Design a protein around this ligand. Structure first.
Ligand SMILES: O=C(O)C[C@@H](Cc1ccccc1)C(=O)O
Ligand SMILES: [Zn+2]
Length: 307
């Protein structure tokens, strides 16, 4: 509340709490972390990315996004945690310190502000954006169906009323469009991670096609390593594989897009649990989720810095 050291990481926060946190952290580590506004959401809320950097030109960078699907509250919670941890581990953890010395990290905690507000406001289980319009009384697009990676194919609904609506066209949602433009403009991203919940999966491309990525052996071996890492803390068991194979065919997904942009290291995480609590994971499992997912992510990032 008064400092990032006083913020309660073991509870779920609202939008303004999260935003105010961002500003604290920036304040406490001005040499390490910047706040960027890459856009504004459908209902005009600012969209923020934290950049963690030790300097340099346009260093290779790591993208992380959380909270694309608003009801997956454990993601935004992990995101806050990550932010602090980056600030904590730099100069303490030799590994993490080798990473930031050579790459930047871009973290988007609340990818989907509007639907986030709406989960607190009115329906806890809202998933989509809050876009309106057209020949529909139904609001919102499945932002993780809106990307230009086999847009509109099977694995997404063309019904506005659908929980998996894909929207009117690829990149129609300003929440997506804004990441698209920013990553295309940066042009030096090496990894692209998107955090979801639940069902404990680590996923690489594709979702939209049966076709194998050419990097399949590496990304699988990376996935494998990551999963092994994560499990090490608390013994949380994760399955890994390509989307379509592991979860289901899904079109217009983040990772397919990123990967098609030449960002080799594209992974999505589906965090705890497996169905016991589902989206309404207990405040008590925040920290132990964050810690373990951490190791998973840190393993991807070391692989990244190394190849
Ligand atoms: O919602 C989730 O957590 C599941 C996620 C499966 C997915 C992963 C990566 C890419 C595309 C689709 C989705 O349905 O968006
Ligand atoms: Zn999701």
């Amino acid at each position: 509340a008064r400092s990032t050291n006083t913020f309660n990481y073991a509870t779920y926060h609202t939008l303004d709490e999260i935003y105010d946190f961002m500003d604290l952290l920036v304040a406490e580590h001005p040499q390490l972390v910047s706040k960027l506004q890459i856009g504004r959401s459908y209902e005009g809320r600012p969209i923020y990315v934290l950049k963690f950097s030790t300097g340099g030109s346009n260093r290779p960078a790591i993208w992380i996004d959380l909270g694309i699907h608003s009801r997956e509250w454990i993601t935004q919670a992990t995101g806050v945690w990550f932010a602090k941890k980056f600030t904590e581990n730099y100069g303490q953890n030799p590994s993490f310190t080798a990473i930031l010395d050579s790459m930047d990290i871009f973290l988007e905690i609340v990818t989907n502000p509007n639907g986030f507000a709406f989960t607190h406001s009115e329906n806890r289980l809202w998933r989509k954006t809050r876009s309106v319009t057209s020949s529909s009384l139904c609001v919102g697009v499945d932002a993780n169906r809106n990307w230009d990676a086999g847009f509109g194919k099977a694995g997404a609904s063309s019904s506005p009323c659908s929980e998996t609506y894909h929207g009117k066209y690829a990149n129609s949602e300003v929440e997506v469009k804004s990441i698209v433009d920013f990553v295309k403009n940066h042009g030096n991203f090496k990894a692209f991670l998107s955090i979801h919940s639940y069902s404990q999966l680590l996923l690489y491309p594709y979702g939209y096609t049966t076709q194998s990525i050419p990097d399949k052996t590496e990304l699988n071996q990376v996935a494998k390593s990551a999963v092994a890492a994560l499990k090490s803390l608390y013994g949380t068991s994760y399955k890994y594989g390509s989307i379509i194979t592991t979860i289901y065919q899904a079109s217009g997904g983040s990772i397919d897009w990123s990967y098609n942009q030449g960002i080799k290291y594209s992974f999505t995480f589906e965090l705890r649990d497996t169905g016991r609590y589902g989206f309404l994971l207990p405040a008590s499992q925040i920290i132990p989720t964050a810690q373990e997912t951490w190791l998973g992510v840190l393993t991807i990032m070391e692989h990244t810095v190394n190849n």
